[PDB]
Amino acid sequence: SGLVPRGSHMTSILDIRQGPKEPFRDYVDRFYKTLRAEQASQEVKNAATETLLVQNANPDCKTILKALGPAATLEEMMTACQGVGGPGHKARVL
Amino acid sequence: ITFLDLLLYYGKKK
């Protein structure tokens, strides 16, 4: 990008990274808010989104995100980071 | 799983 002498609304989505023990819900809260104000066009930023979202997620969360895959949606990810999503299913642990 | 999906998540629930 370029041609911007001044456009510092809040172009800093790069600083929005999920801590190793940080809830994905709080991560997305800041991520989405900042990305919404990111100085880029929708298709441009959304292309980065799919990468950054997983990239700046911690290994543990990232492992969960990958186990779901692109076949699952953000809503699923939000619940996935919260545990398994639904206990009493496959009585292996609980 | 893009900004699109992020928007639909806050706006709707599917």
Burial A55-94 (b: 16+ CB within 10 A, else e): ebbbeebeebbeeeeeeeebebbbbbbeeeeeeeeeeeee
What do you get for the CA distance between the two ends of chain B, in Å? 12
In this structure, which amino acid lies at residue B6? Answer: L
Instruction: Write the CB contacts of A75 (distance below 8 Å, at least 6 apart in sequence).
Output: B9, B13, B14
Chain B environment of A73 (Cβ under 8 Å):
1, 5, 9, 14
Structure tokens of A83?
A: 């545990």
User: Distance (Å, rounded) from C-alpha A37 to C-alpha A14?
Assistant: 13
The CATH code of domain A1-94 reads: 1.10.1200.30
For A9-77, the DSSP string reads SS--GGG----TT--HHHHHHHHHHHHHTSSS-HHHHHHHHHHHHHHTS-HHHHHHHHHH-TTS-HHHH
Q: How determined?
A: NMR
Task: Please give the DSSP secondary-structure letter assigned to residue B8.
Answer: H
Mutate which of A16, A29, A32 to disrupt the B interface (most B C-beta within 10 Å)?
Answer: A32
Would the CB atoms of A42 and B4 count as touching at under 8 Å?
A: yes
Task: Please give the DSSP secondary-structure letter assigned to residue A83.
Answer: S
The helix or strand, by DSSP H or E, that contains position B3, with its residue range, turns out to be: helix B3-11
